């Protein structure tokens, strides 16, 4: 769980770049997922390309007991609660007829438990289907076809994808009869009517006051299994844009929020939303120093092949997340009326494995 901390840290820095390029647009993203796929990529890279990835990420995949820690981490996040509620996948695709380095395919399999996929990219259509069917089969058909694979052509040599789906039942369900339509106050001051769920309960809560004096509501919603939680953060005042918060956001801060919470009764009103985002990882990664890997005759992929040059043609994350009411002796009812928190303005959410600290999901909702 030294790995869980560094991955989330790297993953949240990537989210930050994605948010800064999509102001006033919804985004859902996976810090764990981008960290996971880049770990795999480290093993195919060498020289200055490998150093660029390792300096951003804060660790090397070759180091003793690091690939086994990722595998242990994987199973702790997914073993908990399965079914069609959570779903994840990483894959690298390389041109089929390249001579690969001796012993690489077996070596990759020992560390990660899967192959580097080999496909004939000159069979353009075939290769599009193979890459879309990989995502489709492995996410139980919950995510729509990748857009970015339209760039895939005869000259394409290397492609990496990551895809996740999440739809959790809560620890305590939202009572359904309190679900209705309410005005949501967009960042440009206009409103839209949207369905919002409502629940009275004891919640883990804290205020967060940034250094300029604007204060925020930080609220925790545990999922069933008592293992994962969704964190909700929103400035109180509508005048404070959410970029003030995403620009100073880190994996560590989210832990400080948690570490300083208390159980208090509230009546929470939260939008019912669904969100799907395809993210092209090129520019976010470039901004964190990983420039060489995308560039012809700069990229050093000599660990995967020393017969021919390679470079990443396309690097994509696609995530989809659902947020609804569903959940799963002596419960005593409120005598007094609880204080209210209404999330009817753009807000941040984080999904967090509390034991490890892993940030599974992160996003901004500018219009639910």
């Amino acid at each position: 769980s030294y790995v869980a901390h560094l991955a989330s840290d790297f993953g949240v820095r990537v989210f930050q770049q994605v948010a800064q390029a999509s102001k006033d647009r919804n985004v859902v993203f996976s810090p764990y997922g981008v960290a996971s796929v880049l770990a795999m990529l480290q093993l195919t890279t060498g020289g200055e390309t490998q150093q660029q990835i390792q300096a951003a990420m804060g660790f090397k995949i070759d180091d003793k007991g690091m690939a086994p820690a990722l595998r242990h981490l994987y199973k702790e996040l997914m073993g908990p609660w399965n079914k069609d509620e959570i779903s994840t996948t990483d894959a690298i695709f390389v041109q089929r007829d390249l001579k690969l380095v001796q012993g690489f395919m077996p070596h990759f399999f020992r560390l990660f438990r899967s192959t580097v996929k080999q496909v004939d990219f000159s069979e353009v259509e075939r290769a599009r289907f193979i890459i879309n069917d990989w995502v489709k089969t492995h996410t139980k058909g919950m995510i729509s076809h990748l857009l970015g694979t339209g760039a895939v052509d005869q000259l394409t040599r290397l492609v990496l994808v990551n895809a996740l789906y999440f739809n959790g039942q809560w620890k305590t369900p939202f009572p359904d009869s309190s679900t209705h339509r309410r005005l949501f106050h967009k960042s440009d001051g206009s409103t839209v009517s949207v369905p919002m769920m409502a629940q009275t309960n004891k919640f883990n809560y804290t205020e967060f006051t940034t250094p300029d004096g604007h204060y925020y509501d930080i609220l925790e919603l545990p999922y069933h299994g008592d293992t994962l939680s969704m964190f909700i953060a929103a400035p109180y005042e509508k005048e404070v844009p959410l970029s003030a918060l995403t620009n100073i956001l880190s994996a560590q801060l989210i832990s400080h929020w948690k570490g300083n919470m208390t159980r208090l009764p509230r009546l929470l009103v939260l939008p019912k939303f669904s969100l799907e985002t395809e993210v092209d990882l090129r520019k976010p990664l470039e901004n964190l120093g990983m420039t060489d890997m995308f560039r012809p005759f700069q990229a050093d992929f000599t660990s995967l092949s020393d017969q021919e040059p390679l470079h990443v043609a396309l690097a994509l994350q696609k995530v989809k997340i659902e947020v609804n009411e569903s959940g799963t002796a002596v419960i005593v009812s409120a005598r007094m009326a609880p204080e209210e928190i209404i999330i009817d303005r753009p807000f941040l959410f984080v999904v967090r494995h509390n034991p490890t600290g892993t940030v599974l999901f992160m996003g901004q909702v500018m219009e639910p």
Partner: nanobody, 115 residues
Framework: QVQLVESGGGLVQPGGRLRLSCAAS????????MQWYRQSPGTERELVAA????????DYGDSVKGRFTISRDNAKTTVYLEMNSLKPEDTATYYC?????????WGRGTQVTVS
């Protein structure tokens, strides 16, 4: 009831250090941002340092240049400013302020003199 009492200031030599401190009472310290400002005759009041209530998120005035460090102790309701590599131009009255908008509070200041 509300009180912000600064201390730690004084006369020092160019290149010397100081540690400012402000004792706070009469309001929910742990939910307020804490800040330091400075002012001398003729000048406006200017932001030197600021910190969040939790998570150690900070903010400094352009003139600080990594020389001053702001910290806080929520259990002891106190805020601090460690000042290093002091020069004549830092001579001013230093004020602590507590803010959770729209509410603000001010102390009475402590004099820092350098030469």
């Amino acid at each position: 009831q509300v009180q912000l009492v600064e201390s730690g200031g004084g006369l020092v030599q160019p290149g010397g250090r100081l540690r400012l401190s402000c004792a706070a009472s009469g309001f929910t310290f742990r939910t307020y941002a804490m800040q330091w400002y400075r002012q001398s005759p003729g000048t406006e009041r200017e932001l030197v340092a600021a910190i969040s209530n939790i998570g150690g998120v900070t903010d400094y005035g352009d003139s600080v240049k990594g020389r001053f460090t702001i910290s806080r102790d929520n259990a002891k309701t106190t805020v601090y400013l460690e000042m290093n590599s002091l020069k004549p131009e830092d001579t001013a009255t230093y004020y602590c302020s507590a803010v959770r908008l729209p509410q603000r509070y001010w102390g009475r200041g402590t004099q820092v003199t350098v030469s």
